[PDB]
Amino acid sequence: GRETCYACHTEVKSLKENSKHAAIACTVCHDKTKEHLEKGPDVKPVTKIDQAVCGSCHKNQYESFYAVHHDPTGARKEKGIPAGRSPLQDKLLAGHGFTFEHAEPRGHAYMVVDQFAVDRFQGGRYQFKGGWKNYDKVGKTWDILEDRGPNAKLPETAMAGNPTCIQCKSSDLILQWKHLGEKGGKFDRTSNVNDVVKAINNPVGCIHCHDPHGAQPRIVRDGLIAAIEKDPAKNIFAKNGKTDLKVIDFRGFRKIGVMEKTDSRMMCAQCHVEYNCNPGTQRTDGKPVTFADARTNHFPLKNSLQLLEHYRSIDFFDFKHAVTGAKLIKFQHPEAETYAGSAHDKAGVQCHQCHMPQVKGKDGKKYSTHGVVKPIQMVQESCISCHKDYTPNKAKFMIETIRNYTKGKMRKSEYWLAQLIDTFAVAQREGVSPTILDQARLKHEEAHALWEYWTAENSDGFHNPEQARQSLTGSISASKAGVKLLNDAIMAVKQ
Amino acid sequence: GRETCYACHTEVKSLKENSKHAAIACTVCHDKTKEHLEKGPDVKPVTKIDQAVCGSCHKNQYESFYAVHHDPTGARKEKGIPAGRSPLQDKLLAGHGFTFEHAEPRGHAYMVVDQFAVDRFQGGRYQFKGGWKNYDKVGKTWDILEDRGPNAKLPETAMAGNPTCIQCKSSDLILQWKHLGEKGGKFDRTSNVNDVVKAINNPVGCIHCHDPHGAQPRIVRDGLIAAIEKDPAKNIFAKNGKTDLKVIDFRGFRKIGVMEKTDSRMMCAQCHVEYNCNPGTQRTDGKPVTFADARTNHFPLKNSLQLLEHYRSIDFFDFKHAVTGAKLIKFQHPEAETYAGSAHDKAGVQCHQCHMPQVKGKDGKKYSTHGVVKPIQMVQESCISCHKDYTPNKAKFMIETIRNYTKGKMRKSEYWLAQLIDTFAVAQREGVSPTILDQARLKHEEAHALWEYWTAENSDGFHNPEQARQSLTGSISASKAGVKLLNDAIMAVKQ
Amino acid sequence: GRETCYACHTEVKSLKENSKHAAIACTVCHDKTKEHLEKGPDVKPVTKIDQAVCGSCHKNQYESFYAVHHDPTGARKEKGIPAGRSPLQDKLLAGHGFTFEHAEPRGHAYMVVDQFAVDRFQGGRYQFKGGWKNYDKVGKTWDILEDRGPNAKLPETAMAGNPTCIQCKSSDLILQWKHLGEKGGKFDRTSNVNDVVKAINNPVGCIHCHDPHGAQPRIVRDGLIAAIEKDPAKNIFAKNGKTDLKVIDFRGFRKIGVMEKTDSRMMCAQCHVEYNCNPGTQRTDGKPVTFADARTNHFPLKNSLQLLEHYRSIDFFDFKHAVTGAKLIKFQHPEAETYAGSAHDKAGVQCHQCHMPQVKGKDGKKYSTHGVVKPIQMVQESCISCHKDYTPNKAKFMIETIRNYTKGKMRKSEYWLAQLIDTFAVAQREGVSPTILDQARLKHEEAHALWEYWTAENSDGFHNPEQARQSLTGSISASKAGVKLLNDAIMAVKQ
Numbered sequence A, B, C: 001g002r003e004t005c006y007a008c009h010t011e012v013k014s015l016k017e018n019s020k021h022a023a024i025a026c027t028v029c030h031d032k033t034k035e036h037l038e039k040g041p042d043v044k045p046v047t048k049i050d051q052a053v054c055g056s057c058h059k060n061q062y063e064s065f066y067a068v069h070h071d072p073t074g075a076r077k078e079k080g081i082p083a084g085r086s087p088l089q090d091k092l093l094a095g096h097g098f099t100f101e102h103a104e105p106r107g108h109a110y111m112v113v114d115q116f117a118v119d120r121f122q123g124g125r126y127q128f129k130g131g132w133k134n135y136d137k138v139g140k141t142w143d144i145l146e147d148r149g150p151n152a153k154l155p156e157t158a159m160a161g162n163p164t165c166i167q168c169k170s171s172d173l174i175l176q177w178k179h180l181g182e183k184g185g186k187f188d189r190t191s192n193v194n195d196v197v198k199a200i201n202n203p204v205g206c207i208h209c210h211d212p213h214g215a216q217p218r219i220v221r222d223g224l225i226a227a228i229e230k231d232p233a234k235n236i237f238a239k240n241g242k243t244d245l246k247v248i249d250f251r252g253f254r255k256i257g258v259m260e261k262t263d264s265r266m267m268c269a270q271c272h273v274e275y276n277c278n279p280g281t282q283r284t285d286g287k288p289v290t291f292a293d294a295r296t297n298h299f300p301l302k303n304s305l306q307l308l309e310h311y312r313s314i315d316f317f318d319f320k321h322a323v324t325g326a327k328l329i330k331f332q333h334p335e336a337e338t339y340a341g342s343a344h345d346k347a348g349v350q351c352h353q354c355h356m357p358q359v360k361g362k363d364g365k366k367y368s369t370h371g372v373v374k375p376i377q378m379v380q381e382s383c384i385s386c387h388k389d390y391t392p393n394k395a396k397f398m399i400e401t402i403r404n405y406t407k408g409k410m411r412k413s414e415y416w417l418a419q420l421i422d423t424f425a426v427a428q429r430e431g432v433s434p435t436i437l438d439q440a441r442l443k444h445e446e447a448h449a450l451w452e453y454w455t456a457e458n459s460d461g462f463h464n465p466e467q468a469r470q471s472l473t474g475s476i477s478a479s480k481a482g483v484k485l486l487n488d489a490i491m492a493v494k495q
């Protein structure tokens, strides 16, 4: 009786008819349909957002997403340790909530539990039931975590958590969140995050990347659609002054973007980008930017060489550095913006070919693994599958040589940023002019933007070695110029 | 003729009769017995303290203790290197002898040679015969080391060595050391350490943990007995307002503690504790505390959250920090005090189940390995033996995740301690009030106590992850409070 | 017709007749011989310097030199990273070109391409054709690199490259370089390095260590011959007041040194030494030392305990430290001077026994591998071949224990150098006397000389553990003495 439904749901008919999902009865994914027919539109069907329904017919994708693996080096790797990805984090991000805890990423199945449990999220309120011995448990959020309650305190935590955070950890609010988190849905940007978390039972849904109605490759992330719509000819995913995205707006309430061809650069860019999803400060007037402002659910889709101008253009910065008071941008995991225009991107390779390589399940049916892969741990399938002349050692050597050269420049950029910050403090105590301190703040802004992008980004340059070198040497140059003018100004005081 | 002996040695009769050692002739372990009978009590039998006698009937325990293994990452691992367990050691312990050399522990068979050869012991006087190529040799101290003599100098060494040090490296002085090292035995706390070392041929004896007379599980360490006796109802080993320890006092000269049931927490706490075994300074008057003082052979049996109050209560600190002049506690390897009240302790698991797992020897007789094990190197026997559902990768993941999270907080506590020390120095040079510097010293004391415990402790939180988090975040909080008040006081000067 | 040639080339006759190469026709290695005979000496034969000619009869040496191996940890390892061999490089070498890039060494076949491509060589002018994916290519320089041209800029590079650099990367200029690079050959010390690089097609030739005429073990490096000639009785290679080197001077233009017996300490010392091959400054007058000066192609052949006196004696230093203005020596890879007088040197072991171990080729003919080996990666052939009682773990344990103890002192020397530099800067800002700052500069000179030798040297003490300890503790002592007098002078100012 789908034609009954299709009478008032025309877009679903468009997606589903003559699709690979054509035959699937509406009842497979929607409950209370009879009540919706019999009692009218006031009584909504139930749409349970649930990987297990997709798994009933796609077991290898479902099984590989939920498969539990144990990295013998462990997880919860703080980045701000000496041998870590961001060893000078505590000094360079002084005054930012990331100083409370920032760990390396792990598997997709953990993404909700790790967002809720991190020391920077909600003052330690959410914890693993049974603690560390259950840290590898997957499945339903509230089977895994407990709520210690609103009045509990945990020392050296922060309260960075907000509803927009959840948009990059789950598909559970797809029908309960108006476009951009503007008011009108069950939840919006101004919601109490502790109401929102109760609604999040699952990590990123199968529906995040795949239309349930027709199985079309798609995106559902509001900020990513908004970015592509703002710059449809020149954005990082465009080709020929066009992007492969048809936006479907349901009821003026929620958008999807459907693509004719798989583009995992867009599918993964739903989360693996720089974003603003937090309050901040305007550069002009020093006024707060609150969750009322659309800038608190924002995808720039700009790379390291563009972001400082981009955030100046939209009159926004994240935090003042606790020492220099520089109006700093906080960068997060810009993998899509890094990958854009790199050797592999230009070759037509997409994120999924390295990170979701082909494996065989079960009997021996071929599928894309949905347990996303760390290519250095799987070079036969992530690399040699395409680079057939490569030995495993050659693949590892190529990854690690690029990471080696890039990290050399990252560490040198940190040395110089640390020097800039320490010299600034000395310049302050030597009563150097606030005019000249302001010049140094600008150099800190620039050096910071060209450095922090790369500790935030997860490849240590592999995704774009040229951009990483140009950015990080630009950071070093800016810091050296700041240190020179501060040390010059310090001579001129006592001259 | 044991009844002859038993006439004047009543306690030995109590331990030996109806024991597992009942049948063993006194002559097996004591020489010159006839002269002792014939010439009377003036001529003492010879009691050679020697693992090889125990080995004659317990070959697998003896063989596994002396087995030579080569860790391919080497030994003599200085902790104060960037990638090391205590990377900011040289700054945070400035003014302490540990800045001359402090390496990670290795195997028990090396414990005397490594105490005598470390650069902080006795000005480099003791060295390996033939140098590095013999660094893996086990057996008799003076087959392995040479004495360069009292007048030899070795640059960048220290003279921390003292007789009480030897009490945690050998059973060789069991009959030659009056309780607590008070005067009356061949050696006491005031002895020249260079006389004492000549008497130490073996590492920790079989008799350290096992009664030779009846084979009862026991302790012989004077400071550990003294601690248990001071607090017999509430100490970390107690249960039901009682400790499983019967103290036997021989001649008012030397004590053992015998337990009805194996408690390796007590057996290992003979050495794996925080201790004071060194001169120090009183907090009240600034007067020396010398080896005449019982506080120089002292076991607090207190954890990270208790030690600062404990050392304030007994009016003792180890060193003034070379920069801040904070009256600091020097912490050493508090494994027993950490382990106390942890998940595994509460489950009735003891040190030996993870560190002396069951292995098969020879033919295939089952025994507890007496080559103590680093569980991460042996997860099948140290972990999976009990956690039967664990894979080796799961065991490794669980150890390393806890170490990862704990080290993140350890490194952050060091960052903030370094900031506190650097800010203090700036506050001094900005002529901030000595009143306010004194407030900052108190914050350094607190931050130091809540940090250094964990670099001194060897598990990086595994033994008590909750206590480690509470302590290390407390350290960070104290340092941040010190940095705030110093930076506030620095504004107020030039206000 | 060799007797025709031998008439005017008497030294070649001496080397070639009754040699292992006796039978080889001159035409095998020299072209245009008929024109040289027919047209006279004005028309020089062509002498193509080329491993492939040697390879025609020595395939296993040729094949093993050019064999491509992929270290899975990658290459281009910057030393100035936290976990790196020289973690405080950027601070301690501040004002030296090594701060732009200094990576660990890799295989011999890469030595030209890596010299030309390093960020410190020639402003990034030379790059790998096709970039990173060709970083493992071996063979001809200009098949592997491209020239971006003289006007191209690459941010955060330096221009350290000069002709004398090439003398330790290739045998290609053996007939085109007058002794010491004095004027008269196609190239000299004053040549434009960008003319010189065009002439360098190959890495170190077979002829670097082996005479082509008679196959005698030899050296061709001008600076090494000059050093041995200056001190023929007491130099590090001497025995019995004599060195095994007969110098043959061709035309007063170019020297070789031929040895009766293989001495790989000399063969490898052609490059694995400290050297001066750069402009610098005189200590006395502050005058430049230019490529006109013989001190710009100089081998001291002195160890860590001798170099500071050595460079003071010849009135030379490399750079003023950017903070302290200390007149610092820049140290490079002093492996031969370190190895001299070590346990293995005294035992008659040479570099080649550990680094060119015996392997079997082809069928199974035994040869010395000419792919030089990192012994920790090959302990069966580099170590156990001679230490037959060693297990692989024992060999690794011995290497890594020595490296562990040595690195502990290296890291501690860096901590104290960093403290010296930071204290100096504070002493300057507290207006401490320039007299007392000059005293501290001397302590920085000394501490620097006794430290940087060991980050420059590649064994982390393995080659001479006693010398490393004596040097690095001497560094620590010098820095502590500098920090004491600066901190004392700072009290005395405000006294």
Ligand code: HEC
Pocket (backbone or CB within 6 Å): A001, A002, A004, A005, A006, A007, A008, A009, A026, A030, A033, A034, A036, A037, A041, A044, A045, A046, A047, A175, A251
């Ligand atoms: C017109 C008379 C309708 C027929 C026939 C069916 N549906 Fe419907 N549906 C209709 C309206 C006007 C609305 C919602 C209006 C609003 O914005 O609240 C709905 C809603 C749904 C939803 C809910 C989406 C959400 O916000 O959670 C679902 C999943 C849905 N409808 C499914 C559906 C099916 C499967 C039908 C045939 C059995 C069907 N609808 C008939 C209008 C009408």
Ligand code: HEC
Pocket (backbone or CB within 6 Å): A104, A105, A106, A107, A108, A109, A110, A111, A112, A114, A115, A167, A168, A169, A170, A204, A208, A264, A267, A268, A269, A270, A271, A272, A351, A352, A355, A356, A372, A373, A374
């Ligand atoms: C938002 C819903 C996401 C989308 C869409 C994708 N990723 Fe992701 N990823 C995300 C998070 C929040 C995490 C961390 C989870 C945690 O609990 O820490 C990650 C992690 C990865 C990793 C690391 C995997 C691991 O270490 O085991 C990789 C390699 C990764 N992500 C890649 C990736 C690719 C290629 C995507 C498109 C196919 C993709 N992600 C989508 C959030 C989201």
Ligand code: HEC
Pocket (backbone or CB within 6 Å): A101, A102, A103, A104, A105, A106, A114, A115, A116, A118, A120, A121, A160, A161, A162, A164, A165, A166, A167, A168, A270, A271, A272, A273, A274, A275, A277, A278, A332, A333, A456, A458
């Ligand atoms: C999409 C644009 C995102 C928004 C909005 C937020 N997060 Fe995120 N998160 C995202 C990705 C792709 C990843 C994996 C890659 C990485 O660099 O981590 C993550 C990871 C986390 C993690 C795990 C790692 C860590 O930082 O400890 C946490 C704890 C996490 N994210 C929390 C978080 C919070 C609290 C947010 C709102 C302030 C938030 N995320 C927004 C993608 C996106």
Ligand code: HEC
Pocket (backbone or CB within 6 Å): A105, A264, A265, A268, A269, A272, A335, A336, A339, A344, A349, A350, A351, A352, A353, A354, A355, A373, A374, A375, A376, A377, A399, A458, A459, A462, A463
């Ligand atoms: C092969 C050419 C790749 C493509 C295309 C993309 N990625 Fe990648 N990624 C690659 C490597 C070699 C590495 C280094 C670390 C490693 O595991 O080898 C990375 C790193 C990441 C990470 C960090 C997690 C990890 O896998 O270790 C993330 C989160 C990641 N990459 C995501 C990502 C996205 C979203 C991509 C398309 C925009 C992308 N990668 C492309 C190799 C390749």
Ligand code: HEC
Pocket (backbone or CB within 6 Å): B001, B002, B004, B005, B006, B007, B008, B009, B026, B030, B033, B034, B036, B037, B041, B044, B045, B046, B047, B175, B251
């Ligand atoms: C009473 C007449 C004795 C008989 C019979 C035996 N022993 Fe004895 N023993 C006795 C005294 C009074 C002392 C020492 C007094 C003092 O404090 O110095 C001893 C000493 C020993 C020791 C020495 C312990 C030490 O300090 O090193 C040993 C090992 C010992 N005695 C053993 C022993 C044995 C095996 C006997 C039967 C053969 C024996 N004793 C008889 C008193 C008497």
Ligand code: HEC
Pocket (backbone or CB within 6 Å): B002, B005, B006, B009, B012, B016, B024, B025, B026, B027, B028, B029, B030, B047, B048, B049, B053, B174, B175, B207, B212, B213, B250, B251, B254, B256
């Ligand atoms: C080895 C297995 C032993 C046998 C058999 C016996 N004794 Fe022993 N004894 C032994 C050791 C290693 C020591 C040192 C202290 C310790 O507790 O480990 C001793 C000590 C004694 C002492 C001294 C007690 C004191 O007064 O302080 C006596 C008096 C003694 N041993 C007597 C003794 C007798 C009489 C035995 C036969 C019945 C006998 N011992 C057996 C080791 C061993």
Ligand code: HEC
Pocket (backbone or CB within 6 Å): B104, B105, B106, B107, B108, B109, B110, B111, B112, B114, B115, B167, B168, B169, B170, B204, B208, B264, B267, B268, B269, B270, B271, B272, B351, B352, B355, B356, B372, B373, B374
């Ligand atoms: C004092 C006599 C000790 C007793 C009793 C125990 N241990 Fe110990 N341990 C001690 C020292 C002095 C050393 C270092 C030795 C050196 O030369 O460096 C150690 C070392 C260990 C180690 C590390 C083992 C290794 O790295 O190979 C472990 C795991 C260890 N110790 C555990 C341990 C346990 C479980 C004990 C009770 C059974 C125990 N120790 C007793 C000193 C002493």
Ligand code: HEC
Pocket (backbone or CB within 6 Å): B101, B102, B103, B104, B105, B106, B114, B115, B116, B118, B120, B121, B160, B161, B162, B164, B165, B166, B167, B168, B270, B271, B272, B273, B274, B275, B277, B278, B332, B333, B456, B458
């Ligand atoms: C028991 C309460 C002890 C006293 C008293 C002393 N040491 Fe110790 N030591 C002890 C243990 C359990 C261990 C292994 C665990 C660890 O954290 O090291 C050690 C180890 C050493 C080592 C090896 C490691 C190192 O620090 O380089 C040395 C060199 C050592 N101990 C020396 C030493 C000295 C000189 C003492 C008196 C000042 C001393 N120890 C006392 C247990 C105990």
Ligand code: HEC
Pocket (backbone or CB within 6 Å): B105, B264, B265, B268, B269, B272, B335, B336, B339, B344, B349, B350, B351, B352, B353, B354, B355, B373, B374, B375, B376, B377, B399, B458, B459, B462, B463
């Ligand atoms: C299993 C539940 C354990 C019990 C009970 C105890 N220890 Fe432990 N210890 C454990 C782990 C997983 C680690 C981390 C390092 C590792 O090797 O895996 C440790 C560490 C130590 C160390 C450092 C040496 C080492 O083994 O690497 C010491 C010296 C040590 N532990 C001693 C010790 C003592 C005395 C215990 C009872 C109080 C104790 N451990 C209990 C696992 C477990």
Ligand code: HEC
Pocket (backbone or CB within 6 Å): C001, C002, C004, C005, C006, C007, C008, C009, C026, C030, C033, C034, C036, C037, C041, C044, C045, C046, C047, C175, C251
């Ligand atoms: C004397 C009449 C000669 C006979 C017969 C041969 N050679 Fe010669 N050769 C001679 C002179 C005077 C010179 C060079 C003078 C100068 O310094 O320029 C040469 C040069 C060579 C070289 C060049 C070395 C260089 O600088 O590149 C080679 C390789 C050489 N000669 C080889 C050679 C051979 C193989 C001969 C027999 C066929 C031969 N020479 C004959 C003088 C005379």
Ligand code: HEC
Pocket (backbone or CB within 6 Å): C104, C105, C106, C107, C108, C109, C110, C111, C112, C114, C115, C167, C168, C169, C170, C204, C208, C264, C267, C268, C269, C270, C271, C272, C351, C352, C355, C356, C372, C373, C374
């Ligand atoms: C100058 C012509 C050289 C001579 C003669 C020798 N070596 Fe060398 N070596 C040299 C350079 C310039 C490099 C670095 C090359 C690069 O592209 O980075 C090296 C490297 C080595 C290494 C490291 C090998 C590797 O990592 O794979 C070793 C162990 C080494 N060299 C040893 C060595 C020995 C033993 C020699 C005499 C037989 C020797 N080298 C000669 C420059 C030169």
Ligand code: HEC
Pocket (backbone or CB within 6 Å): C101, C102, C103, C104, C105, C106, C114, C115, C116, C118, C120, C121, C160, C161, C162, C164, C165, C166, C167, C168, C270, C271, C272, C273, C274, C275, C277, C278, C332, C333, C456, C458
């Ligand atoms: C012989 C006395 C040498 C002179 C003159 C120069 N180099 Fe060198 N170089 C030499 C050796 C034996 C090695 C390998 C050992 C090591 O410690 O690196 C090297 C290595 C390099 C490398 C690779 C490693 C690195 O530093 O990044 C480069 C890029 C290199 N050398 C460049 C270089 C330049 C530019 C020189 C003139 C200023 C130069 N070298 C001189 C031996 C010798």
Ligand code: HEC
Pocket (backbone or CB within 6 Å): C105, C264, C265, C268, C269, C272, C335, C336, C339, C344, C349, C350, C351, C352, C353, C354, C355, C373, C374, C375, C376, C377, C399, C458, C459, C462, C463
């Ligand atoms: C065995 C007794 C050796 C002799 C003789 C020499 N070297 Fe060595 N070298 C040795 C070890 C164990 C190490 C440590 C790093 C390792 O790979 O194990 C080294 C290190 C080097 C290096 C650094 C590159 C490397 O191999 O990792 C160089 C460039 C090197 N050594 C050169 C060298 C020269 C020129 C020697 C004679 C003067 C020399 N080595 C002797 C072991 C031994």
Ligand SMILES: [Ca+2]
Pocket (backbone or CB within 6 Å): A274, A275, A276, A277, A329, A330, A331, A332
């Ligand atoms: Ca951001």
Ligand SMILES: [Ca+2]
Pocket (backbone or CB within 6 Å): B274, B275, B276, B277, B329, B330, B331, B332
């Ligand atoms: Ca202590």
Ligand SMILES: [Ca+2]
Pocket (backbone or CB within 6 Å): C274, C275, C276, C277, C329, C330, C331, C332
């Ligand atoms: Ca030099």
